[model samples]
Target chain A: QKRFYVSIDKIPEHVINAFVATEDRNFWHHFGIDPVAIVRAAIQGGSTITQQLAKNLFLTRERTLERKIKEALLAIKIERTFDKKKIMELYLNQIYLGSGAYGVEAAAQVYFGKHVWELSLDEAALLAALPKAPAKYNPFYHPERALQRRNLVLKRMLEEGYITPEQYEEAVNK
Target chain B: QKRFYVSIDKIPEHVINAFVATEDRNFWHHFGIDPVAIVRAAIQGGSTITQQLAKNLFLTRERTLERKIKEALLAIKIERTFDKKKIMELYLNQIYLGSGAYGVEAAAQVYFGKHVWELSLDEAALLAALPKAPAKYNPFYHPERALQRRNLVLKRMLEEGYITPEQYEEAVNK
Candidate 1:
């Protein structure tokens, strides 16, 4: 799939916050890899958003010790190379979503038929939910699963104080 | 002559001030025409920088009541359409300097072998002096006349408070 990269500056604040809230609660707190989160989520499950980015863009998808270690090392170097904003920018643009879409701009067009900048909070959460399980959470085929995951992302955003309670309620309802 | 247009932002502050001080002291205050300056300088002589700009870009060199009146009308409209900075930018770029140089950038390269931005205060004043009578005070053929006019521009700058007495002295000596 042709990757249609969008500049992070064009992406909305809520969209960035949604990804941070859902993907890595301790994104700002941790140094690329969160030891506790790794133990909590399995090696792949606990991978920080940066680690996932490192894996996706640089390393292979193989669930092996060597690859996982390399992903963590690359993530650390990436953190050193760029600021949080740049790291998030790279992660969001390099992520693979389902339906032959690579990156949020491509996914936004594939799912919503609009630019990523035109996306609402709920729409952002829906896109955030897809990266973890693109096929299982395909909004077109398994709308129920997508809706649940979208709501979960909204809940995480609300809990993280990225969105207000009112905003969470309105987005969840939508 | 291939006109090399430099953005107003890239053209240094002293260069802009040199033109304003020499060409039109009432540049910032007047609407388009300065009646007193016009009366003193004669029909073509009294023309404000904007009037000069309007005449150079839009009207013929042939001095007539029709052309002069049209130049004034166009100057007023130009002021209405763009800010003072834009007017100055247009004037500097569209003005004819000697040796087939159509703009300040070309003049800078033709005379000094440098970019307009690289021009020093004395260099800028010399360029400012040329627009009044490019051939009469051509730096290549008549260095004495060019030097005198350049100092006059520096003197005008000092009188208008655009430059200090020290700066005037330094530029004049240079």
Candidate 2:
């Protein structure tokens, strides 16, 4: 059941960076519930990666403001019960990333015929962009669009100071 | 400077019930946020009145998942810092309730030309339905629709056991 449950250690720093840069910038420094994300939801209208994990994996309903509250609460509970790595592992193992991929492991396999540990920088960033809209970012459907989003994630990764400029330039060129 | 803010004690229980029944039944019972609402959001997808209040009045920005988390966090912080009546008070006067209404006080004045304390069950119910869709449910533009929605609040108040059957029947008739 937990064969593909990759640990944070096995995952590259840059890989985790890719998700956090685009999804929840404060994933590490939050109390299971992040007020910053909520403020965003109130005005600009968006959700955090934690909220999405709660909805997609366990809570799976509501989507109302209360549901968001529930998501916040459940996220706290999960945080209480698990470490950041465990939570990130669970989220990575969940959330379909286009083309029959669920979790980073599955995505790595289907997209590039490699395991998660083997995903290159460009491939990791490419996988990072799929969750916003899986069908839209599916590689076969629009390779150009996929690349465009992939590059965006790379840019954010660099901007967030997660990756060196050299690493970013190298990945972008690839 | 503070023309519209009414204290919670000045607001009647029925008016509070009108807001609770349709928006957040667990407002008084739970901590700042609700887990049931989260599971519900996962399935049915909705927002609690408190969550709406968080988004509408205080954290009125972003609406991102991180924002939702921040939203729930702030709600707890607000709950910790203030009483339920205080949060309710601020929300009552903060959100728009159609017909150019900026708070329950304005809603009462604009919709029925009454003070919030003077609003009867039906009138209060009509006001409750406006926050969800202020412009669409304005009583001046759609009296019948507003009345229909008003009756819904009455029915919900009874269904949620907030009001007695006699009170509901009387309110419905009125």
Candidate 3:
């Protein structure tokens, strides 16, 4: 698959924040490793954006405890090495969005046939909803589920103060 | 050229300290990018070991301002992603020692016909000296300069408290 890497500066704040809210709520506050959330994997199956970045860039597909340990280590290293903007940029560009899209730019083009910069807030939230289970959230396969997931993401944005109540209602309405 | 990647735990602390002392004294304290020392390139031509790791792994050999900017950026990312021990492991493994040797393991075998674990303190320091200008410090071509450079690294280790005075004297005498 052709990969399109986009810089963080080009990605909209709404798009970046959607991912942070839907996925890693404490992305900015933590130093990559989020033991509290892991308590919820290693405690449910949640991963910080940094941990996912580490897994994608340097690790394997296995889900053993050892890999998780390495993931935590790499997460810390990544947080230390890159800024929050750059980290978000990398995560956006590296995350797998359903339908063979490997990053935000590609997903934007694939789904909406537009550039990431042109994505509406709701559209960005839809894309943000995929990293957890790309195949399950495939919009083509389950449009209703996709809509529900996207709306949930918009609610998370509201909860995180990334979007106001008015903006949340407008976006969820989409 | 053979490439042997050794783990951080496998490499002797003496070898790690030699490089740290010679390259970046503030490595442990700083967050990858060292503005102070760069105030010493962007001040002299000094780079933190993390910066060098960034350059070697993801950058080119050009010494341009743009490259330095990227190097600094990557250095921060790398420091955040990996522990100091892992960072040292990578730097040691990727560094080019004189005479076609890449990494400490290769350098150790090429110079002393042994593993990095078996390298003497002065020998490790001699290898540490090569990173500045591998060709210039080739022990085979200039034994006196190599000895002097190696001695300087040993002194750095002493200054950094990685070695005792007696250890410094014994290693330097060797």
Candidate 4:
């Protein structure tokens, strides 16, 4: 239930690489957020940091075409005002990545009980493996399947060339 | 975009009583989901005709402690044992509110082209307030006394907590 806002600079190189390699290598791509999915979710309570922030910043999340015109204008505004890394920073720090954590630092503490810097290859790899499906990973309650998921991330890390063969073996075996 | 599927006949009258209004009966109630109806929808496969028009969620395979014990029970039963209705649920689950609008909510958006939740009281009231006779309140069609009556409903809806001041004011002044 704790959140630690570790700036991107403070977030380790490997953690950044691991997240990039796993989640959205093109993460430098685009932004949310279907804004009208904004207010509806906000009222219905399906919203989180990302949505509130989007609407907090713009009136454009509506799904109708007129608002879509508004959405594109806002997207252009973001594209011009904030660079990709900055956008990624907001995304990483804002989206829920399971275990009630938001970013790598908080996730490290939630899953490993250490600062993200303390997380070794496997530790970081496991947290990196989350987000595709949070409830499915149940990092807090179950271990049988979660351990397998962590291995898969380490595997992807290996395939993506972010980690060495030996490193993958160690993470999987450990 | 247009009206379709007028045949949800199985939508029982007792269930209608939960939503419809004085032209209807004790239907004046706003948001209480009837558990008996939820259960019957499971056993009888009549989810849509009876689903709440405001927020019809098919919790079949949805989650978590609602803290409202009965909510949990209703959610669980609907989820665990209802697949047929679940299958038919999303496909043709909306009602026709004329003017080529599907469902009363969409009528709000289709006719006015705005987010329904963002609607002002007069706008919302124009939808709900006219349950008995709506021809008199059509925004474009009824530009006089009926429009005033619609605005009156908008004001009352604000006092009723259905909308915020900005939303209330936005519609009121218009």
Candidate 5:
């Protein structure tokens, strides 16, 4: 099959958890766009994952009010057609990973020479962090910066109780 | 200083060579986006680095005619304002590396726990393979796909006479 079968059961808990934390913390609750995140990003002058994906897939990455409107419309459409899990999978597959990698599967291979199912918790966290900015946090170009970000993600996992304190500490130390 | 200073001279020849091979083969000859490459991508419905960067920085990742026009415009503007090396640096720095690494420095450390300058040839090639589809070709997620792409890049390097057949074989065998 062109697409691998990743049932809801087959999908890793960590993958689901990681996607929730990174993309939509309120995905289970929200309809399409998280109004709270939108307002927050507006106030802080940033873009959320939904907004970004909307912009990337539907709207041309242009800086104009028209494009923004189109992005919102497309986001709504996507929300209507796809459930949270489906959207999450599509987003993960579509987003760019530095080094020509396209999806989680490609990224896993490029980093550790392993399979996605075989990824350790630490490795998954590492992969999860790239959706925001790949090059800036890339360890190769800026190790210190990447390490700082990686640790930050680990801290979030700990705070969310996704990872235990010991696990978090070990990951941070690693 | 928070920022590492890499003199143009200190910048490894391989880095430059890799950039040339991936970003712009005739960087000295082109203004910013390679017109030839752009034309080719346009015909094949692909994207040039300049267009992709413009989309990443300014436009939404939407697929539309207007967005493409804006991408071209911004690419021209970027070309006018930034030198070749500067543009290359910006492009390198702005890309997303899987595992939350954003730049080459971060990517190197995250993947290999090594400094940028310390990256081995195979490591460099691995990094080079990331830009197109980081997640899809990620080593951890899809080792076979990543290895396939890596071998392809190595083969290209060998064909270009950048390395000997022995070196290519060694890299592939790895």
Candidate 6:
């Protein structure tokens, strides 16, 4: 299927928050691009979440000025045409899932033999860390690396105050 | 000693950048407080480096409104009285160095059996990670966690474009 639909309500709060925290913390506030984060990242040589998503979904992974410009243009287009949930849904569905899995549902089934709706906090966190550098950190191929990356995400979540210390400790230790 | 002098030229660029990146990326630009970082940390339930240093050095380690207000005032005073290099030097010196070491020189001797200037990159990074949670992540007590943290700082330094990838690899492998 070219498209898949998941109800916005079905998505967990942490899932949305994780996306915002990891993807675009200023999504609600920005017109399209977060100029501050973009400029800051430029100064610091880091990529903003929108830029990352743009590079992932549309442009090639090469680090060329031309590719970056393309990613920026696509980001503006995506922002203008889609609402937050729809953009998120599109990102979730279109992102490459390791082991030939495509969408969230497919990835979930491939990894855990379950549907997307059944994904737990641990599972969600596990999936979230993959996009940063998939081949190096994929759980199936690099279980140890994935666990390390997932723990880092959980730490970020805890540090961001999305999860309590106890909750983070439990999740990471699990 | 009430005040210790360390020239900006003497301090390693990487070390200065490490402190700036962790504490205040906008230290050079800001008067004292980076309001944006403070707000972001507040939103994430994390403390900014300035607030953290204040709590560790002056205020009680309690999460209260009064502590925050006092921290802000103290941060401003410290910034106004001292240049960026001096503020960083004081901040670094005032921090608890593991095993009863109080300053950078003392920390160098205790942690690596060397003078501050003679301390290698690995040793420097190990000392850098100690301030986050001195007692908990101390190399003497928790060598594994300490190593993880040092590597994390090295990784952050690399990601922030403060160091070359080759330098990062060397630090990690050292």
Q: Which candidate is the best by TM-score?
A: 3
TM-score of predicted structure 5, chain A: 0.84
Clashing pairs in 1: B38-B46
Q: What is the lDDT of residue B64 in candidate 4?
A: 39
Against the native chain B, what TM-score does each candidate's chain B reach? 0.92, 0.89, 0.93, 0.39, 0.82, 0.83
lDDT of 1 by residue, A87-169 (tens): 68757876778998877888889999999999999999999999888999999999999999999999999999999988988
lDDT of 4 at B63: 36
Model 5, position B89: C-alpha lDDT score: 57
On the 0 to 100 scale, the lDDT of residue B47 in model 5 is 49
Q: How well does candidate 1 match the true structure in TM-score terms?
A: 0.50
lDDT of candidate 5 over B16-109, digit per residue (tens): 5664565555565665456677677676334445655566654236778876776676566555433456556545655665766666777777
Candidate 4, A21-69: lDDT as tens digits: 6654434443534445445557633332223333323212345656444
What is the alpha-carbon lDDT of model 4 when measured against the actual structure?
A: 0.50
TM-score for all models, in order of appearance: 0.50, 0.48, 0.53, 0.38, 0.47, 0.45
**Which candidate gets the maximum DockQ versus the true structure?**
3
Tell me model 5's lDDT, rounded to 2 decimals: 0.64
**For candidate 3, lDDT tens digit of each residue in B33-79?**
77788776662466788888767644225778876775686677656
Interface RMSD (Å) of candidate 1: 25.5
Error of 1 at A132 (Å): 51
Q: What's model 3's lDDT at A11?
A: 89
- In candidate 4 chain B, what residue range of length 10 has the lowest lDDT sum? B22-31
Instruction: Report the C-alpha lDDT of model 2 over B1-174, residue by residue, as the tens digit.
Output: 124656677898889989988888778877778889878878643565566555643222565678776556556544543446655765777677866567788778777778999988888898888877887877787877888888998999999998898988899998
Considering the two chains of model 3, state its CAPRI-style docking category. Answer: incorrect
What TM-score would you give candidate 2 relative to the actual structure? 0.48
Off by over 4 Å in 1: A1-174, B40-44
- Candidate 3 scores an iRMS of 13.5
State the C-alpha lDDT per candidate. Answer: 0.81, 0.74, 0.81, 0.50, 0.64, 0.65
Off by over 4 Å in 6: A1-174, B1-9, B42-49, B56-63
Model 1 Cα lDDT, one tens digit per residue, B26-82 = 898898889889787764367789888766643125788876785687577556544
